[PDB]
Design an enzyme around this catalytic site. Sequence first.
Site, PDB file in Angstrom:
ATOM      1  N   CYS A  12       0.861  -1.192   0.000  1.00 48.03           N
ATOM      2  CA  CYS A  12       0.000   0.000   0.000  1.00 48.03           C
ATOM      3  C   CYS A  12       0.896   1.241   0.000  1.00 48.03           C
ATOM      4  O   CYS A  12       2.149   1.101   0.091  1.00 48.03           O
ATOM      5  CB  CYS A  12      -0.828  -0.088   1.255  1.00 48.03           C
ATOM      6  N   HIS A  41       4.840  -4.764   9.696  1.00 47.61           N
ATOM      7  CA  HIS A  41       4.759  -6.241  10.073  1.00 47.61           C
ATOM      8  C   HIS A  41       5.170  -7.270   9.011  1.00 47.61           C
ATOM      9  O   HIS A  41       4.379  -8.096   8.539  1.00 47.61           O
ATOM     10  CB  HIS A  41       3.373  -6.570  10.643  1.00 47.61           C
ATOM     11  N   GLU A 126      -1.210  -0.416  16.412  1.00 45.80           N
ATOM     12  CA  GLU A 126      -2.056   0.682  15.915  1.00 45.80           C
ATOM     13  C   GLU A 126      -3.113   1.071  16.998  1.00 45.80           C
ATOM     14  O   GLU A 126      -3.385   2.278  17.247  1.00 45.80           O
ATOM     15  CB  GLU A 126      -2.709   0.332  14.571  1.00 45.80           C
ATOM     16  N   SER A 269       1.876  -5.128   3.698  1.00 47.79           N
ATOM     17  CA  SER A 269       3.302  -5.066   4.147  1.00 47.79           C
ATOM     18  C   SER A 269       4.309  -6.064   3.490  1.00 47.79           C
ATOM     19  O   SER A 269       5.475  -6.083   3.849  1.00 47.79           O
ATOM     20  CB  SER A 269       3.398  -5.201   5.648  1.00 47.79           C
TER      21      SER A 269
HETATM   22  C1  LIG Z   1       1.011   0.383   9.313  1.00 49.39           C
HETATM   23  C2  LIG Z   1      -0.323  -0.250   9.107  1.00 49.39           C
HETATM   24  C3  LIG Z   1      -0.563  -1.241   8.201  1.00 49.39           C
HETATM   25  C4  LIG Z   1       0.495  -1.824   7.319  1.00 49.39           C
HETATM   26  O1  LIG Z   1       0.546  -3.276   7.381  1.00 49.39           O
HETATM   27  P1  LIG Z   1       1.218  -4.102   8.638  1.00 49.39           P
HETATM   28  O2  LIG Z   1       1.214  -5.595   8.315  1.00 49.39           O
HETATM   29  O3  LIG Z   1       2.500  -3.480   8.987  1.00 49.39           O
HETATM   30  O4  LIG Z   1       0.214  -3.785   9.848  1.00 49.39           O
HETATM   31  P2  LIG Z   1      -1.147  -4.492  10.358  1.00 49.39           P
HETATM   32  O5  LIG Z   1      -1.891  -5.066   9.164  1.00 49.39           O
HETATM   33  O6  LIG Z   1      -1.597  -3.286  11.066  1.00 49.39           O
HETATM   34  O7  LIG Z   1      -0.561  -5.549  11.319  1.00 49.39           O
HETATM   35  C5  LIG Z   1      -1.457   0.270   9.942  1.00 49.39           C
HETATM   36  O8  LIG Z   1      -1.730  -0.578  11.051  1.00 49.39           O
HETATM   37  S1  F3S Z   2      -2.647  -0.988   5.134  1.00 50.79           S
HETATM   38 FE1  F3S Z   2      -3.677   1.098   5.229  1.00 50.79          FE
HETATM   39  S2  F3S Z   2      -3.316   2.243   7.233  1.00 50.79           S
HETATM   40 FE2  F3S Z   2      -1.668   2.901   5.794  1.00 50.79          FE
HETATM   41  S3  F3S Z   2       0.037   1.476   6.078  1.00 50.79           S
HETATM   42 FE3  F3S Z   2      -1.209   0.695   4.325  1.00 50.79          FE
HETATM   43  S4  F3S Z   2      -2.562   2.465   3.727  1.00 50.79           S
END
Ligand SMILES: C/C(=C\COP(=O)(O)OP(=O)(O)O)CO
Ligand code: F3S
Length: 309
Positions: A12, A41, A126, A269
Amino acid sequence: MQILLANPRGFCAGVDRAISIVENALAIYGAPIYVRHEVVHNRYVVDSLRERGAIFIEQISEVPDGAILIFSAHGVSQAVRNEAKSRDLTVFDATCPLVTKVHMEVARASRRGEESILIGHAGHPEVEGTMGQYSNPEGGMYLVESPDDVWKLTVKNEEKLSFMTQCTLSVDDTSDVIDALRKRFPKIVGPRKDDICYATTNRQEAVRALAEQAEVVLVVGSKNSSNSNRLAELAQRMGKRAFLIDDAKDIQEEWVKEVKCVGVTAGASAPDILVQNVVARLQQLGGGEAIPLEGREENIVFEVPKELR
Ligand SMILES: C/C(=C\COP(=O)(O)OP(=O)(O)O)CO
Ligand code: F3S
């Protein structure tokens, strides 16, 4: 075996921006660059940068004096941000702007004394970052994960009530939680729908489409990636076998043995390189050329701070 690829998948805007903040900090100031929590992550991005000279630490105590510190893309609480500032550190904030936007609304509710309900998952960073935008003792900040959690919640003044959501939730489960809040609290205010980001929304729709062609769905992502988990989980509740894998090495051949159509996607991610290797691994276990499905366009880019270009 036909390999299909979901669309969209993978990176993203907020993740691309956060990884680039760390690389460009590393490039402008050299190792070491300290980073609080894994910047995103993903095991592979995090070992990628850890060996380019970035150091991942869990508390600001661990970081020395005069050192450069980056906040991860999941964001941080006011407390953390303050504990960093009062220690003479150069700080760069990789928090996704889509998280910041939800921080701003929380802090708006704090100032006006009014109570807030976060829909999100306990102990996710988050969530910790977002609840920690609330500090006013007059009101409150409360966490709900399901309708049951809503059916048990009590609040000081259900007349002045708002809700916010974690960005990386299931679109469907979140919908049911909101349904519960509006019915227990007919005055509650929040967004026309939720605070789930466009990337989580899109990846969900895409994997839904993918899981209606593929018998098996492989989701590239690390165990601790909430959004990646929603992808596998979505596929499974459609009755497909689905596995969250860090990379090609985790593919067990029994998972694809005799499978006519296997689908691949990637959390927001997970880097494309991991997906490419997973595709090469499927081609060894008998699959053809990877076919990408048609998908919703993504055009959003978030640029790094000017100081870091
Ligand atoms: C930074 C962010 C999303 C990016 O993917 P991530 O896999 O880092 O995070 P999440 O899906 O929250 O465990 C917002 O929580
Ligand atoms: S999953 Fe969504 S919250 Fe930001 S880090 Fe990527 S656009």
